[PDB]
Amino acid sequence: MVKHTLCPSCSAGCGVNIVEMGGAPVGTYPYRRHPVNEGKTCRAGRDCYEIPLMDRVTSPGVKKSGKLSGVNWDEALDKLTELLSSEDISILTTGTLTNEEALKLREIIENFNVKKSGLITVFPEFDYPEIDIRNIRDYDNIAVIGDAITCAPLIGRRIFHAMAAGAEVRSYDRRDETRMAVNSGFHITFSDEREVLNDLQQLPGGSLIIITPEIPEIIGPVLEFSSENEFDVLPIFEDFNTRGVMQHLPPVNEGEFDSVWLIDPGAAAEPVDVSGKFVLQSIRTEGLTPDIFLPVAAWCEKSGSYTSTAGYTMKLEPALQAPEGVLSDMEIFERILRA
Amino acid sequence: MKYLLARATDEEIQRKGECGGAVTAIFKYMLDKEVVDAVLTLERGYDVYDGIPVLLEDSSGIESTCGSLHCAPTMFGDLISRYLSDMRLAVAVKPCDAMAIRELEKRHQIDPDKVYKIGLNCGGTLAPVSAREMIETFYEIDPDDVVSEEIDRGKFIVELRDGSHREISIDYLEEEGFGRRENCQRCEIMVPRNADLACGNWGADDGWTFIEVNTERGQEIIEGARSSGYIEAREPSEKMVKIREKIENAMISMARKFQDKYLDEEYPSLDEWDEYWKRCINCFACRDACPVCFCRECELEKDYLLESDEKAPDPLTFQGVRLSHMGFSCINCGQCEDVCPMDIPIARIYHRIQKKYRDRTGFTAGVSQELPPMYSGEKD
Amino acid sequence: FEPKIVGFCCNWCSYGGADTAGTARMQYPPNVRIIRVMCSGRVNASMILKAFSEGADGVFVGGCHIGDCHYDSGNYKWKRRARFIEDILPEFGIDKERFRWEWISASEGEKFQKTMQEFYETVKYLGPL
Amino acid sequence: AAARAAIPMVKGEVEIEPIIAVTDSDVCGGCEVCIELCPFGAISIEEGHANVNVALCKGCGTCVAACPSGAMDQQHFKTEQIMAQIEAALN
Ligand code: SF4
Numbered sequence: 034m035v036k037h038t039l040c041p042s043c044s045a046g047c048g049v050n051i052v053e054m055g056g057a058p059v060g061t062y063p064y065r066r067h068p069v070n071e072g073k074t075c076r077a078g079r080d081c082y083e084i085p086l087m088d089r090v091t092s093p094g095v096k097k098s099g100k101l102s103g104v105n106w107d108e109a110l111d112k113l114t115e116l117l118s119s120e121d122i123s124i125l126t127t128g129t130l131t132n133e134e135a136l137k138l139r140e141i142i143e144n145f146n147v148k149k150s151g152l153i154t155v156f157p158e159f160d161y162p163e164i165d166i167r168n169i170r171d172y173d174n175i176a177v178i179g180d181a182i183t184c185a186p187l188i189g190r191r192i193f194h195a196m197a198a199g200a201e202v203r204s205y206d207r208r209d210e211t212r213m214a215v216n217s218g219f220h221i222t223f224s225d226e227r228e229v230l231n232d233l234q235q236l237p238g239g240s241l242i243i244i245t246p247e248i249p250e251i252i253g254p255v256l257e258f259s260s261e262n263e264f265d266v267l268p269i270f271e272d273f274n275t276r277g278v279m280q281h282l283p284p285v286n287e288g289e290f291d292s293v294w295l296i297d298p299g300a301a302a303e304p305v306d307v308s309g310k311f312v313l314q315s316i317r318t319e320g321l322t323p324d325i326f327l328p329v330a331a332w333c334e335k336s337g338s339y340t341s342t343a344g345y346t347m348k349l350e351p352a353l354q355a356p357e358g359v360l361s362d363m364e365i366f367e368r369i370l371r372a
Numbered sequence: 373m374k375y376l377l378a379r380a381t382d383e384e385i386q387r388k389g390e391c392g393g394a395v396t397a398i399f400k401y402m403l404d405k406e407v408v409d410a411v412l413t414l415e416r417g418y419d420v421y422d423g424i425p426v427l428l429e430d431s432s433g434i435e436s437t438c439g440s441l442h443c444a445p446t447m448f449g450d451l452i453s454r455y456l457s458d459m460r461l462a463v464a465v466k467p468c469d470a471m472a473i474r475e476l477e478k479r480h481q482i483d484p485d486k487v488y489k490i491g492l493n494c495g496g497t498l499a500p501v502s503a504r505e506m507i508e509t510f511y512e513i514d515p516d517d518v519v520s521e522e523i524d525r526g527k528f529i530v531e532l533r534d535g536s537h538r539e540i541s542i543d544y545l546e547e548e549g550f551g552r553r554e555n556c557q558r559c560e561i562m563v564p565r566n567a568d569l570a571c572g573n574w575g576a577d578d579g580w581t582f583i584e585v586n587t588e589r590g591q592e593i594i595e596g597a598r599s600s601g602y603i604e605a606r607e608p609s610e611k612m613v614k615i616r617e618k619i620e621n622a623m624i625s626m627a628r629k630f631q632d633k634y635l636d637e638e639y640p641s642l643d644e645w646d647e648y649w650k651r652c653i654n655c656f657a658c659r660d661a662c663p664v665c666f667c668r669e670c671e672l673e674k675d676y677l678l679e680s681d682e683k684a685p686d687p688l689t690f691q692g693v694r695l696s697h698m699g700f701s702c703i704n705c706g707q708c709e710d711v712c713p714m715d716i717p718i719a720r721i722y723h724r725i726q727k728k729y730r731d732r733t734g735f736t737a738g739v740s741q742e743l744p745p746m747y748s749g750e751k752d
Numbered sequence: 753f754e755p756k757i758v759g760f761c762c763n764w765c766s767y768g769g770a771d772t773a774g775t776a777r778m779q780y781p782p783n784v785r786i787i788r789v790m791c792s793g794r795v796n797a798s799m800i801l802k803a804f805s806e807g808a809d810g811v812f813v814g815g816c817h818i819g820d821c822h823y824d825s826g827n828y829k830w831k832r833r834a835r836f837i838e839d840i841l842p843e844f845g846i847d848k849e850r851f852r853w854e855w856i857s858a859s860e861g862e863k864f865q866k867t868m869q870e871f872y873e874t875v876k877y878l879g880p881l
Numbered sequence: 882a883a884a885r886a887a888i889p890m891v892k893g894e895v896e897i898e899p900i901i902a903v904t905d906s907d908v909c910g911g912c913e914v915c916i917e918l919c920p921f922g923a924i925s926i927e928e929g930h931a932n933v934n935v936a937l938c939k940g941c942g943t944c945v946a947a948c949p950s951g952a953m954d955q956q957h958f959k960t961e962q963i964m965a966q967i968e969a970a971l972n
Pocket residue numbers: 040041042043044045046047070073074075076077078079185186187188
């Protein structure tokens with residue numbers, strides 16, 4: 034009935050309980066024991082229980098003339114394997130796989146000798162420190178780039194704890210009324226990148242830099258400056274396991290996608306331009322029609338590990354039962370390798 | 373039969389039971405002899421700090437749910453009203469659970485004929501992570517290696533795996549910002565007389581549960597469990613009844629003193645309240661957690677009230693509206709404050725308002741069977 | 753400083769009282785804005801709180817005398833609500849003198865005039881909210 | 882008085898004002914905190930939802946003001962209308 038699980042809505046590692054009645058998810062319950070949020074959730078955390086039921090597609094779909102028609106799993110895994118071996122396939126994944134599934138995806142990427150692949154994320158490959166968010170209050174100086182409270186409310190909670198602890202918090206964004214702008218010790222509405230960087234020159238060594246993805250072009254320079262001068266960088270990634278997937282799969286830095294295979298079990302992928310073919314492996318087609326569709330289990334219907342932005346890793350047993358006809362991404366990968 | 377001392381005729385249920393296992397034996401009888409369809413209780417997770425609601429449709433392995441959990445400040449009223457309002461149920465309720473269930477029954481969200489309330493005496497609960505940190509800091513032990521908790525002596529007592537007991541003044545822990553939740557310190561009701569039965573260990577011997585029978589439904593429960601040979605029961609001393617009465621009175625006096633402390637003399641100022649309200653992210657966790665806020669559609673989400681920008685809402689059109697809607701029925705369960713992502717002390721203001729209303733009109737939320745005088749149809 | 757005042761008046765007596773004051777041409781300050789309801793029982797705390805949140809510096813409610821309600825029991829329910837609202841308002845920095853509720857009969861134009869004048873003086877003295 | 886009383890009886894019909902309470906069944910939770918507030922007993926409960934009798938309702942609006950969730954609403958005195966008037970009075 035009541036089962037522990039992770040909130041998939043953002044990259045904070047908040048724990049929730051799913052209340053299941055007769056095999057279906059019916060509600061949410063506070064997961065007070067979880068250390069990231071201690072049973073506190075934003076609205077999305079309390080709404081996450083509806084995801085496994087909303088517009089769920091649970092049967093493989095191969096695009097017949099014009100539209101998508103049902104098909105058995107073997108007839109899709111074939112017509113996918115041939116596509117891998119023959120055509121120029123680029124594999125793109127969101128930060129919604131389990132860590133083990135990401136390792137398997139790396140194995141596949143090597144086996145089929147794909148040249149372009151990786152994780153969809155605006156952040157680069159960095160030596161991010163493993164920061165405990167409960168330690169955010171310890172930092173004397175915290176620089177916040179982007180609206181961190183809105184991006185991850187339960188990390189903004191720790192920023193508030195830090196403010197109450199005496200830390201001086203400086204916020205930077207292109208807007209001057211965001212939640213961080215309102216609640217920061219000092220806010221700057223910069224229009225030129227150096228504007229923020231100069232102020233970052235005033236930080237002491239060992240200061241915290243909480244950076245969101247709202248300002249993409251600043252991530253590179255800020256990480257370069259933080260690599261120098263010894264700052265601890267805390268990113269706010271896009272997906273609930275962007276960090277875990279990035280551990281194995283590099284961020285995709287190509288822009289010539291055709292015949293792409295999108296692996297988005299969490300349905301978090303933004304509309305991606307596909308010049309050629311479009312294989313979609315998700316829990317709900319919605320969006321546009323894909324050439325092939327492989328329904329998968331939801332984040333809470335799997336067994337596996339997820340890593341939050343801070344670096345907290347959580348091992349999960351399924352909170353629900355996967356609907357008939359859907360396979361975990363691990364099963365798809367293993368069968369594709371076997372074929 | 374206003375008073376009894378009871379214990380499970382079984383031996384495993386007695387062993388793993390907190391105080392002779394009368395509650396578990398009663399639930400076992402209720403399921404086996406088909407008084408109800410199911411039992412809603414608690415079960416510990418992967419440690420004593422993780423409590424999870426469980427719905428047992430049969431008594432096999434019921435013993436896994438015995439024992440108290442002071443680090444499990446759970447609420448069952450909204451669970452029953454949202455999911456189990458159709459089935460014949462028996463539930464274990466702390467006084468706040470019974471108060472929420474009574475506020476919901478008078479609003480026809482729960483059928484009183486369907487729900488049997490085996491209430492438990494309650495001296496307060498603690499938050500799990502906070503309890504772990506307190507034990508780490510002030511007991512000089514790992515939060516792990518602890519297997520029980522208790523607040524009998526006025527001391528918070530943890531029972532280490534080996535068998536040792538470590539007790540520290542709950543007054544001293546509370547003075548340091550730890551111990552029971554603030555709403556529990558203000559709580560005025562320790563004996564759930566708004567339940568069919570009230571079970572505790574105040575007037576009870578070791579290995580026995582003191583049970584006060586509040587209603588004839590409770591009397592039927594007790595006599596059915598005793599005739600069916602699930603619980604053995606006898607009469608209290610009537611020297612122990614006075615000890616229990618004195619304990620209840622002393623706890624009530626302490627609750628009144630803490631009410632004065634938190635609601636008047638350490639109450640946040642208007643500037644401090646402004647600083648708090650500036651934080652609110654409009655997540656509605658407080659309303660969702662509140663058992664009295666049961667409505668299918670909430671007025672706080674209407675266009676003319678809902679704050680549509682990504683900024684702190686005006687506390688008037690959110691907090692004052694919710695206060696006008698239900699603050700006369702606020703049971704001081706502290707669920708709103710527990711779940712707030714922004715760490716706002718909401719239960720303080722709601723309890724203070726309810727106290728004003730109760731002082732004026734004499735309505736006590738969760739205890740009176742009738743609706744608040746606000747809803748009276750008479751010319752009174 | 754010119755305070756902003758919002759008024760709620762029942763159709764049968766208090767609105768009638770304001771009409772009586774008008775017909776007799778009893779002058780009073782123009783700050784109040786009257787909104788008509790059938791009964792003072794139609795008024796609830798959400799309206800008062802919305803008024804104060806939208807910029808009102810005072811809120812007046814007028815009803816039939818107890819025992820004179822056209823719908824025979826509505827003003828009782830309003831009276832209960834009004835006491836609770838007086839409880840709630842000071843918790844958010846709104847003095848309970850900014851929230852006035854009175855029983856005005858349809859023929860009590862002079863009482864309505866005096867209430868309006870005095871409430872205006874009170875709210876103006878309190879200053880902007 | 883005879884003439885004045887004869888006029889309506891000759892007409893044979895009178896109009897009832899439709900300013901009455903209406904319940905949204907999809908929103909009403911059957912809490913019933915509205916029934917006792919009607920001095921004329923116009924509100925009953927059918928199928929777990931509040932139901933208003935037009936013949937008994939007089940249109941005071943007390944029940945509508947009492948309903949927290951807003952399932953009950955008075956015709957011609959809806960909550961949105963009064964809220965719009967309050968907003969316009971100050972803006
Ligand atoms: S902060 Fe992020 S992880 Fe936590 S409840 Fe909100 S959306 Fe979910």
